[PDB]
């Protein structure tokens, strides 16, 4: 009988309960997006990588949901390598930031995916 840990066990939604993705796994998730005609985009956050409530408390209001966009969504991107190269540029510039890959479905007209691609040391 194991007791689920309490300290430093913050999660980042989809796929965050699995062992961290290898470059191959990461590339396979990116291909899923491309094959579905979804637009990939990267987001990073250096301050609080988790949800909190500072500016308001009414139902459905939370701070920390929006992170900052790395460049622009990658319209027309056809190669998972392009995306992963960007993840590298981003990590190079923000080695202290959490980085996640998100995707937009222009037909459903909504953001449709979001998975942590990089966590800074000790997370």
């Amino acid at each position: 009988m194991q007791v689920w840990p309490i300290l430093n066990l913050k999660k980042y939604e989809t796929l965050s309960y699995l062992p961290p993705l290898t470059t191959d796994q990461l590339a396979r998730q990116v291909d899923y997006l491309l094959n579905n005609k979804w637009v990939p985009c990267l987001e990073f956050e250096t301050d609080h990588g988790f949800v909190y409530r500072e500016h308001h408390n009414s139902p459905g209001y939370y701070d920390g949901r929006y992170w900052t966009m790395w460049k622009l969504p990658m319209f027309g991107c056809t190669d998972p390598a392009q995306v992963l190269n960007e993840l590298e540029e981003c990590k190079k510039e923000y080695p202290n930031a959490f980085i996640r890959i998100i995707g937009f479905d222009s037909n459903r007209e909504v953001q449709c995916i979001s998975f942590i691609a990089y966590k800074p040391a000790g997370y």
């Binding site: 194991q2 913050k10 989809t14 796929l15 699995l18 949800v51 009414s58 209001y61 939370y62 909504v110």
Partner: protein, 455 residues
Amino acid sequence: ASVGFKAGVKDYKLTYYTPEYETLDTDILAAFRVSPQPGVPPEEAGAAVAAESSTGTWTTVWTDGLTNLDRYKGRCYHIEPVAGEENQYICYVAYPLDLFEEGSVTNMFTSIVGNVFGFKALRALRLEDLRIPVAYVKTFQGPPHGIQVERDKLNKYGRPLLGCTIKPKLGLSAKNYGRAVYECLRGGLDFTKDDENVNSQPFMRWRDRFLFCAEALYKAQAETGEIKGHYLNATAGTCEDMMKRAVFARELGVPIVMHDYLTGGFTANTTLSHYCRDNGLLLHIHRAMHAVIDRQKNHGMHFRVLAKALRLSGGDHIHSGTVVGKLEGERDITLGFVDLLRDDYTEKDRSRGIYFTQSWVSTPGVLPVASGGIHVWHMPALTEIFGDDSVLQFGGGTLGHPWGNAPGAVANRVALEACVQARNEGRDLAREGNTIIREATKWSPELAAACEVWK
């Protein structure tokens, strides 16, 4: 309509059976499964269903001459035999837009289903489907939020959401109830839930439950960093009590409330739906009592009709049963009403029980909730059948884990994420489900423990 009076009984048939009728885009169409009494021919039965759910009177009345009743009558415009059933037919009936009160599901059901089911010429009657015209759809608010907005508020993407009903439903004190809630949420589930029966009772008054559940959910959210919710049941005896409950949930700043729409009723449900929209609260709908009406094939109303009504009145989630434990066909029927709940347009498809093409003119979709005897081994199946836009609920499947609620939650969250990753990599969930689960047990003691207990 009209007259040259002369009182007396008279006959339906010619007046209500209009096989030549071309339906209007503004008409509400109904598909009734009619089982006539022996000796009643099909045309006669169909005409009776139409007359009895609109203007048919048992004896001529002079006032009909003050209007044009043709403009108001229901019309049986088509009849077709049911295969593998003797003396059973599908009769299609058209109702003019003008018979209905705008925005009132209560009036829609009263008009179509309020009287016909007791007609003596019929042995049994079942409403299978309704085509709600877009001009009537526009008179309703629909879901307070709907699929797209819910995911955006919660910041949850690319996988089914996960919940857990707290058990035992009755018996726990508000505080022990909240303790169970915190242990479940901290393990990775997105929501916890009040049983449909949990309203306000001697051992656990509602306000105390709402309060401890709030403490538990905020603690789990702070620990995990992921947004959490607990479906706080607002179902009550009067509109006033229901509103008091919704108002306190608002005060607590929590994200979601719950209502048993059939036992509470459509009038109260529409009130709560409007309040949730105005206050930013998600609304989880429980279908308690549905089987009293939708179970038997020969009499009642099929659940797809009760699901359309809820999408109009309003709800963000609705229980749709599990597809597990049933043969195809029943699997196909479920997938059929799931499309009717989520999509903007669904084409007629008799193989899935969809009798009419249905458009929703951008009314938000409702998230279907799969619940009922499910555990980790059904995960590949559920993910395959429902896709991402669904809520999978595990009551016994979570609180029944040998190490407790938290590990029970971890097991379910890992099992789900393993399936999502596999599907995304192109693996076949239908063929490789058990292998996907087993591989995950290699690195998840929590999942391995669960897999040992069930199936």
